[PDB]
Amino acid sequence: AHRTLLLRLSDSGEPVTSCSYGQGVLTLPSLPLPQGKKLGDMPVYTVKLAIPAGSPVTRDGLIWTNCPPDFSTQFDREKFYKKIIKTSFHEDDHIDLDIYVPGTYCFYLSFKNDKDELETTRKFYFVVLPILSVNDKFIPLNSIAMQSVVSKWMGPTIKDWEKVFARVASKKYNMIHFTPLQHRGESNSPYSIYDQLEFDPTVFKSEKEVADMVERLRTEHNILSLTDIVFNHTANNSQWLLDHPEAGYNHKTSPHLISAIELDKKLLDFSEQMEALGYPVDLKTVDDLIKVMDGIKEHVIGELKLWEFYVVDVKQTVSELREKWGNDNIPSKDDSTNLAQFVRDNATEPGFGSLGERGSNKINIDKFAAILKKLHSEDYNNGIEELATKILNDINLPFYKEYDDDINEVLEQLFNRIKYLRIDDHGPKQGPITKKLPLSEPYFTRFKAKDGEEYALANNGWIWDGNPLVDFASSQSKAYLRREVIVWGDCVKLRYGKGPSDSPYLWERMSKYVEMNARIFNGFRINNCHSTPLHVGQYFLDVARRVNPNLYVVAELFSGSEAMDCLFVERLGISSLIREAMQAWSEEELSRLVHRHGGRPIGSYKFVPLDDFPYPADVKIDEEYCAYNPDDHSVKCVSEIMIPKTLTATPPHALFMDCTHDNETPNQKRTVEDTLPNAALVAFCSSAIGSVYGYDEVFPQLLDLVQEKRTYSCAENTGISKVKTLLNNMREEIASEAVDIEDSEMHVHHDGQYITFHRTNAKNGKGWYLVARTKFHSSGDQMLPRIKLSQTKATFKAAFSLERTGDAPISDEIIEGIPTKLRELTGFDIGFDENTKETSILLPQDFPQGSIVIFETQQLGIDDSLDHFIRSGAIKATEKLSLESINYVLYRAEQEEYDYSEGRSGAYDIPDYGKPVYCGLQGWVSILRKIIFYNDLAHPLSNNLRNGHWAVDYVVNRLDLYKDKEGVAEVQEWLRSRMERIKQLPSYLVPSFFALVVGIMYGCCRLRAMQLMSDNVGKSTVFVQSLAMTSIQMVSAMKSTSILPDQNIAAMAAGLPHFSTNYMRCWGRDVFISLRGLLLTTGRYEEAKEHILAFAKTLKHGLIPNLLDAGRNPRYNARDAAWFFVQAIQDYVTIVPGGVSLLQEKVTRRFPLDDEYIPYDDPKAFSYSSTIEEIIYEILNRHAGGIKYREANAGPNLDRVMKDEGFNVEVNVDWETGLIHGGSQFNCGTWMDKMGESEKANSVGVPGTPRDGAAVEINGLLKSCLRFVLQLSKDGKFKYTEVTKPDGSKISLSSWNDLLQENFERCFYVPKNKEDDNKFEIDATIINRRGIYKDLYRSGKPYEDYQFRPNFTIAMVVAPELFTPDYAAGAIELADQVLRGPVGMRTLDPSDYNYRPYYNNGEDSDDFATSKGRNYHQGPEWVWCYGYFIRAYHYFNFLTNPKCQVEGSAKKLKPSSYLYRKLYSRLLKHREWIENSPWAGLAELTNKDGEVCNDSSPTQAWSTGCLLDLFYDLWISYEE
């Protein structure tokens, strides 16, 4: 059915962590194959790789992976396959990795660098666990009970072994771990193997014998099997070690140990001659042990040549010097020792500073002459002897000090270990000399080979602390020399190299040894895996997995850190890590160990796709979460939306051993009674568990793996066997339903000698409660407090006490255990309050140390059908939503909610935190995303969610205000029914289920939006869809305002929250700048029409107003609005199908045509009907014919700081140029309309940026309007070409169009060369940078004409014909370098003297430029200008730079990856902003260089709509 996981990658190809579970590994969940199918019938898993659109990796990017393409292909580690990344700037690309067989797979990405070079990412591994079945019943990996048994002590025959099998089968273990079942060596240690390719001839002969015994275990006792595999060493007496001695580190293969060889055999030569030498041998004399090796200083050290291994032979070099004296970096005595080291780095020969031969380090005498020729006496006798001798002696000064530090560690390590082995340090074991025991532990197992030579391999062991990853036998280490090796004489080196080329027979023999056990057993076990080299373990485990595809791997892995552990688990394919419960020194350490492997906290948050995922409109869905069948064994999606289960790093699985075959007995470390609680605490952990044989049967002491020959007793059902039968059988009931990490929860408590373990299943509410009194020591009576479980019922399951009945039987042929009584306990009182639904549990006074009690518990209100009810129905509930109604479910600012609630409601106040930014689900999701990611159950929202049901009912009771709107009623009922069911749960579970219901409904709403919008939005990246959701944030119906004076309908707000209510909401300039991005790009055609019709009614003076008071008394101080309005009409007709129908739409006009007064009530309002066709011409003709007025109701009651002359602004056209002028020095007719008001700074009524005269945007939009109506008349959709002049003259629209074409660039452009200043009208006394397009033509203050501002880019976008390309490309490149901030566009050139980029509206200081906000447009970085900027930056770079073009499919020149990369880099700060903002949008304004402006509006309509304009450009022109 559906076995697909989603693996999202970053912009650098790295996998993204959906949750923070800690340092982990991309492990895929162990699940049964679909019923009936077997390996190969279908992909076991499919990893969906998600690559971000436009990321640098997509540039000629390839997905490499070592995953076989099909089941027929064998797995090769280093054979990677190619996958083509489908590059797009809008849509992410998904690439499936079909996996047919378990193993270790990895992937990396190759792409074209920014340097046009090739680059590669890291290799990223993910493991697919094996499928463990016994007959035809699936064994989940975390339900494994492993009994580790040792072959030596199981008996003589196979039938004597099957007696042990029947005993562990009664204890209901399902896996047996075999110590190496092979031929042992001269020590009978199970880990020193004679020949790895034959089994113990005492027990088995052929492979068939051991293989049939294993298959008998599977069939008769339902028990699987695995074995220890030894890679690091072999026995010291192997007949194949005589044939192939190069398999170990010898003087040929590893020459550096030659010095260590001659020191080890300098002790096997002294330990035998230890009568007269070292005369007091076994005399236990601490005050004479000095003398014991004070003579060794001369017995070995003095007889080892002062060690020429380091030191250059001084006189044998002067001999070699005189021998061959005939054949500008030179120092002198002035660099005393640099002269010496000059030879060390310029005159030494291949192999210096290198341990190997006795005379390995030497000198190059043939070029020593050429160097010494450019020196002193060209004749040796003259004292060059002593000179070179000192030069050489100076060279050997560091080697001598390297020697003294070496020797000190050689003997300091000796007189410290000699003590412990024999002398009573803490563990005594005396002994003088022999061959069984010597003086020095053997360091180099020596023998004679079949080639006749006397070889010298060595043993292996473990240094105390030494990277536990380096080879002490390798040349990098000096441990065998300085005697820093704790050796095992039983075992001998195994020298693997960089591959099979360094030791061919060793790699070939271990290959057939590994695959021999892989044919038989279900898996392996690797002791000291951290010491086996990585490339060695990877190869042989891959060979094993080719034989046994379901190979289960256990490893005792204690590397340097958790990261190194995860890397080994990643690459090797380890399926389980060994944890030892006996390592806990105290009760607190045991509860902490139990805490790590117990599970997740109770009431943990559940993952959900939120506002960080793409929501493709064309997505498959489980309409009622019902397309699942239990026999399919599919991994389930989170909700009705079929976004597959996420693949995230999880901690490597664990196999918790209450006691291994290497650690001491409970009897030894603690007491015998601790065997019962220590095993119960381990068995309650949500992982794999195991135990050594004898732990359950309470053997007295740890069995010596080397010496002991006694056999396991046949005494059945001793000690814990009865309890382990109960525990293992209980875990078999649980294993059927528990699946993933979010599905098993835990609470663990430690109170003195008691440890509480509460195991809970998060799906059904079932659980187990374990009370375990530990017996680390007999430490007096201790009473445990009353146990209180909230909203839970408890049931007694079982209870036991373990008591010691005397000491252990002493025998010489059986290993018998300490007698133990197993008494069942009673007295536990379980009280249940039928009101508070609280269960109390009291322990009885007869509960001695070493006892346990188990309860079956069930959380109230939870059943198996809860998860289905919460995850279903939400899509059908959103079926009737609309792009308007979604605004009331997801957003609504607090002021927006007061509008509907008359100021009673508002946003929920989270105590100790505050209120969510929106009232709807977005306000919750913005807070919940970080909470779920970190499982922050301590967050104030998490605390409040379990403290009461207030937030639960707040989500449902809000929608009573908007119940009548489309689809809101059914959305509320879904929330009502689900939240009602949630309140019936225990309090501590409410937060997890609250965030689950909210996220599910939020996802269904966000998907509903993408479906209602157009394809370009509904198929794009998260960033584009996040931008598009701002359209829903701003378009809402209100009560206190609207866009129509008669009705309350949807109205685009300027920004939230401060531009949302009353007249502060609608602004004509803001509406029509954002109309194309928020409404046309998204597909809201009918809503964009309503806004055009609404403002068309409010035309006066031939001008569209900025401040719209819903069409009653609007403010007409906007010289910009009318041209953004007539441009939006052009954008409407260009995009909307059948958009020319808008021109003949008839709006009821309002204030009379003759620029009359204010009669909203007088019947002269609903009077002269006007079509959009005549409204456009009414604007074009009224500007040309001349306008002269003073604002209606002029006086303070409109602008109480504007001056008397400021109220009479006006406008007309200079017909020698054809462009529009207007404004004055007391004006603010443009978008930079900050009016001063500071009385302490003396600026009341002074505008900060009046833009009088020819504005670039107005003239650019005018040219766009003229070009629009000209082609419109060509198609018979515009009747008019006559334009009246104040006198009465007439000019055709084409002539006015050509006038700007001939004169616009002439007036505004400032040429780079001083030569052509005589053509572009420039007074060079007032100029700053050339190559710039002007900001204003003939303004009041002429220096404001030649200022670098982002406004000229509006003209470049709407009227590109006005620009010669080379001038426009160079001018916008300067803006990229000078005026472009990270998110906003600098409103004024930083090099200017008026540049103040910090905006503070409350400043009272006496600064004329900064006080009370005059800076508003003189430095601050605005985000919407960035949209118009990057739109033209894309356009003119695409036309100018040849690097920005590449071949177009079917011959249509498209942009290049070079340009897409430059566009993508400039939007990263925007995608970051909308990602990490409580308001899901972009700010209106930003202080200098990205600094947050507190006074800026957090989400603005035209800040995002201008970015959506860019994406629509790239889509509508290329993506066809």
Side-chain angles (χ1 to χ4, degrees), residues 329-609:
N329 22 251
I330 313 294
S332 49
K333 334 289 218 67
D334 315 331
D335 292 315
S336 167
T337 348
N338 182 43
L339 163 85
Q341 212 272 150
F342 174 72
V343 173
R344 206 224 117 97
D345 219 52
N346 289 89
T348 52
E349 252 213 326
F352 204 75
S354 57
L355 256 347
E357 309 260 284
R358 186 106 64 171
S360 54
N361 306 336
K362 214 42 196 171
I363 236 83
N364 186 247
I365 43 183
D366 40 277
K367 261 59 235 162
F368 204 6
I371 289 186
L372 259 171
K373 244 116 79 169
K374 329 153 63 68
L375 226 2
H376 306 114
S377 176
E378 291 191 35
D379 189 289
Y380 145 73
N381 56 43
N382 184 214
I384 303 295
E385 182 264 290
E386 294 110 299
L387 169 119
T389 304
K390 183 109 225 301
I391 288 184
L392 298 176
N393 258 279
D394 292 6
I395 293 176
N396 300 279
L397 290 178
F399 290 113
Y400 266 104
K401 227 62 182 182
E402 194 191 292
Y403 171 72
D404 296 316
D405 295 1
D406 277 7
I407 273 300
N408 290 16
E409 267 286 317
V410 170
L411 45 78
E412 274 184 354
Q413 227 70 22
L414 276 167
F415 82 93
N416 293 334
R417 62 174 144 260
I418 286 175
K419 285 221 306 159
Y420 172 79
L421 195 66
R422 354 260 258 274
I423 279 309
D424 185 22
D425 290 15
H426 209 184
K429 241 299 299 161
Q430 257 270 59
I433 37 172
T434 16
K435 19 257 125 255
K436 304 94 205 311
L437 120 112
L439 152 110
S440 56
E441 314 193 18
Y443 265 31
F444 283 87
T445 292
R446 16 195 70 101
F447 62 92
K448 300 106 175 67
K450 291 307 180 64
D451 43 58
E453 310 194 34
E454 321 174 348
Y455 270 93
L457 305 188
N459 334 73
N460 81 316
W462 55 292
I463 321 177
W464 197 244
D465 345 274
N467 106 312
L469 269 94
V470 83
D471 221 326
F472 26 78
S474 73
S475 60
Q476 300 208 331
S477 173
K478 206 173 297 182
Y480 285 105
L481 212 172
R482 304 215 309 178
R483 281 254 162 188
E484 307 173 21
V485 184
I486 303 176
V487 293
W488 306 324
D490 331 311
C491 316
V492 140
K493 285 167 157 169
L494 279 189
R495 180 190 69 88
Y496 314 88
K498 310 166 300 183
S501 302
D502 278 359
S503 297
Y505 188 66
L506 178 53
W507 287 74
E508 173 57 33
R509 258 280 302 281
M510 296 298 150
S511 61
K512 306 234 297 298
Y513 159 57
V514 163
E515 62 188 321
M516 184 176 65
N517 296 264
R519 288 186 287 264
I520 300 167
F521 303 92
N522 299 100
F524 294 161
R525 193 253 192 183
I526 312 174
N527 62 327
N528 293 338
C529 175
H530 46 272
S531 287
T532 299
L534 263 170
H535 64 341
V536 177
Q538 296 169 18
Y539 182 75
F540 293 113
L541 288 184
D542 293 325
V543 174
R545 258 184 290 268
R546 275 185 280 270
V547 170
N548 183 13
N550 294 316
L551 186 85
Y552 184 77
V553 185
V554 203
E556 183 178 53
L557 180 58
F558 169 56
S559 176
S561 60
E562 276 206 15
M564 256 301 104
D565 291 335
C566 292
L567 188 140
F568 272 74
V569 175
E570 262 177 2
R571 302 182 179 179
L572 298 175
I574 305 182
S575 37
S576 295
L577 253 51
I578 285 178
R579 311 303 184 183
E580 302 185 4
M582 286 288 111
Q583 298 286 62
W585 171 253
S586 60
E587 291 86 343
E588 62 178 47
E589 296 188 29
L590 179 58
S591 55
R592 287 199 268 106
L593 269 172
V594 168
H595 185 63
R596 262 188 249 120
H597 315 293
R600 280 172 92 237
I602 299 186
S604 217
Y605 281 101
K606 318 289 170 50
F607 175 85
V608 263

Side-chain angles (χ1 to χ4, degrees), residues 1 231 324 382 437 698 1140 1205 1360:
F231 293 113
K324 201 149 99 185
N382 184 214
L437 120 112
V698 284
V1140 292
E1205 37 270 289

Side-chain angles (χ1 to χ4, degrees), residues 807-826:
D807 306 323
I810 330 278
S811 93
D812 300 296
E813 35 246 64
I814 229 72
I815 320 183
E816 230 130 51
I818 306 188
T820 47
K821 194 218 185 309
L822 194 68
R823 177 171 56 98
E824 302 173 349
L825 306 179
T826 330

Side-chain angles (χ1 to χ4, degrees), residues 109 151 175 196 291 310 473 481 724 765 843 1128 1170 1198 1468:
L109 310 185
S151 132
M175 180 158 298
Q196 348 285 119
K291 306 167 49 194
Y310 314 152
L481 212 172
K724 275 278 180 62
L843 289 183
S1170 298
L1198 277 64
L1468 287 174

Side-chain angles (χ1 to χ4, degrees), residues 190-331:
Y191 296 93
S192 61
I193 310 190
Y194 191 103
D195 179 71
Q196 348 285 119
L197 261 66
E198 79 146 1
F199 299 95
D200 199 19
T202 320
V203 197
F204 316 96
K205 294 299 183 182
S206 52
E207 266 186 74
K208 188 95 184 283
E209 256 174 287
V210 11
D212 289 351
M213 183 193 60
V214 171
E215 194 79 24
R216 266 185 235 110
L217 270 171
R218 277 97 77 114
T219 52
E220 300 170 350
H221 301 299
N222 289 264
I223 297 185
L224 307 171
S225 324
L226 53 76
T227 11
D228 301 65
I229 297 301
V230 188
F231 293 113
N232 311 272
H233 54 243
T234 190
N236 53 25
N237 51 103
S238 300
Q239 48 210 5
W240 59 268
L241 275 178
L242 305 171
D243 298 6
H244 299 261
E246 81 285 349
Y249 311 78
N250 45 76
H251 67 83
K252 297 179 177 179
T253 61
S254 71
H256 61 281
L257 298 167
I258 287 175
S259 57
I261 294 178
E262 299 182 10
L263 183 51
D264 187 23
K265 79 182 191 66
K266 201 64 179 183
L267 302 175
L268 293 175
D269 172 63
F270 169 73
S271 298
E272 252 48 51
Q273 290 98 286
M274 248 194 111
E275 271 44 67
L277 299 85
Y279 32 106
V281 186
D282 218 52
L283 273 310
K284 356 94 73 182
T285 35
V286 255
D287 46 272
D288 168 278
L289 239 284
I290 16 156
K291 306 167 49 194
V292 167
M293 12 89 57
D294 259 62
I296 237 190
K297 169 259 304 117
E298 39 111 4
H299 287 157
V300 293
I301 287 181
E303 249 176 81
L304 285 161
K305 307 292 303 176
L306 232 180
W307 290 94
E308 302 125 328
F309 272 89
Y310 314 152
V311 171
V312 174
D313 205 330
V314 277
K315 255 295 179 177
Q316 209 255 346
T317 315
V318 172
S319 77
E320 278 170 23
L321 233 209
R322 169 193 259 180
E323 224 100 40
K324 201 149 99 185
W325 187 256
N327 247 79
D328 204 61
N329 22 251
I330 313 294

Side-chain angles (χ1 to χ4, degrees), residues 20 929-937:
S20 179
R929 180 147 69 92
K930 246 202 143 184
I931 293 181
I932 306 177
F933 183 84
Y934 289 127
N935 193 37
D936 190 5
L937 289 167

Side-chain angles (χ1 to χ4, degrees), residues 972-1210:
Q972 187 195 38
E973 179 54 40
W974 187 93
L975 292 175
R976 186 184 261 103
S977 63
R978 269 62 187 175
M979 295 300 190
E980 176 74 18
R981 181 74 173 81
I982 279 183
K983 292 181 293 181
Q984 305 173 1
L985 301 184
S987 74
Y988 44 83
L989 293 163
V990 180
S992 58
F993 283 93
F994 171 86
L996 192 70
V997 160
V998 170
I1000 287 174
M1001 176 48 77
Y1002 177 88
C1004 296
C1005 290
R1006 183 147 175 161
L1007 169 71
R1008 195 71 256 265
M1010 301 299 109
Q1011 297 169 333
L1012 294 175
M1013 290 184 177
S1014 58
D1015 290 338
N1016 55 311
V1017 158
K1019 296 179 177 179
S1020 54
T1021 323
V1022 201
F1023 174 54
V1024 183
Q1025 297 191 339
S1026 300
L1027 292 173
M1029 289 302 292
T1030 303
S1031 168
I1032 305 183
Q1033 299 188 8
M1034 302 300 188
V1035 185
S1036 331
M1038 302 293 272
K1039 306 292 190 183
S1040 61
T1041 176
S1042 177
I1043 51 174
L1044 275 165
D1046 47 329
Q1047 319 175 36
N1048 288 310
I1049 61 170
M1052 174 192 301
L1056 310 182
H1058 301 306
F1059 303 107
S1060 56
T1061 47
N1062 301 295
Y1063 63 77
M1064 298 289 296
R1065 183 177 189 84
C1066 303
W1067 299 85
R1069 166 182 304 118
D1070 302 336
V1071 167
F1072 296 101
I1073 292 181
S1074 332
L1075 185 140
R1076 201 186 94 104
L1078 299 184
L1079 304 176
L1080 298 182
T1081 298
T1082 59
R1084 292 230 236 173
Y1085 299 153
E1086 292 291 74
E1087 295 269 326
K1089 191 182 65 174
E1090 295 292 326
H1091 286 60
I1092 296 177
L1093 305 186
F1095 279 91
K1097 308 159 116 287
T1098 68
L1099 192 78
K1100 188 153 105 268
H1101 331 281
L1103 291 170
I1104 281 296
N1106 189 24
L1107 192 157
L1108 181 70
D1109 199 332
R1112 61 189 70 164
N1113 290 244
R1115 164 68 92 98
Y1116 294 93
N1117 64 340
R1119 298 182 285 107
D1120 272 2
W1123 302 109
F1124 293 104
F1125 163 79
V1126 80
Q1127 177 64 81
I1129 297 180
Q1130 176 184 3
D1131 295 321
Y1132 187 94
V1133 179
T1134 299
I1135 299 177
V1136 177
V1140 292
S1141 172
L1142 175 68
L1143 296 178
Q1144 225 70 358
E1145 208 84 66
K1146 289 158 47 186
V1147 299
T1148 294
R1149 205 121 115 72
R1150 199 57 51 175
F1151 287 10
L1153 233 165
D1154 54 298
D1155 290 354
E1156 215 172 313
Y1157 274 94
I1158 305 90
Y1160 171 65
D1161 290 286
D1162 300 355
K1164 26 176 51 210
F1166 224 86
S1167 290
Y1168 58 113
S1169 164
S1170 298
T1171 66
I1172 271 65
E1173 175 178 318
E1174 50 183 280
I1175 289 295
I1176 297 177
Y1177 162 77
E1178 183 171 334
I1179 300 180
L1180 270 173
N1181 189 31
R1182 199 69 158 277
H1183 280 82
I1187 50 176
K1188 220 63 191 179
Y1189 78 89
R1190 127 163 284 185
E1191 295 199 57
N1193 316 98
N1197 205 10
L1198 277 64
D1199 197 327
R1200 289 215 182 257
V1201 298
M1202 194 182 235
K1203 290 174 176 176
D1204 178 56
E1205 37 270 289
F1207 287 102
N1208 38 84
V1209 352
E1210 266 325 67

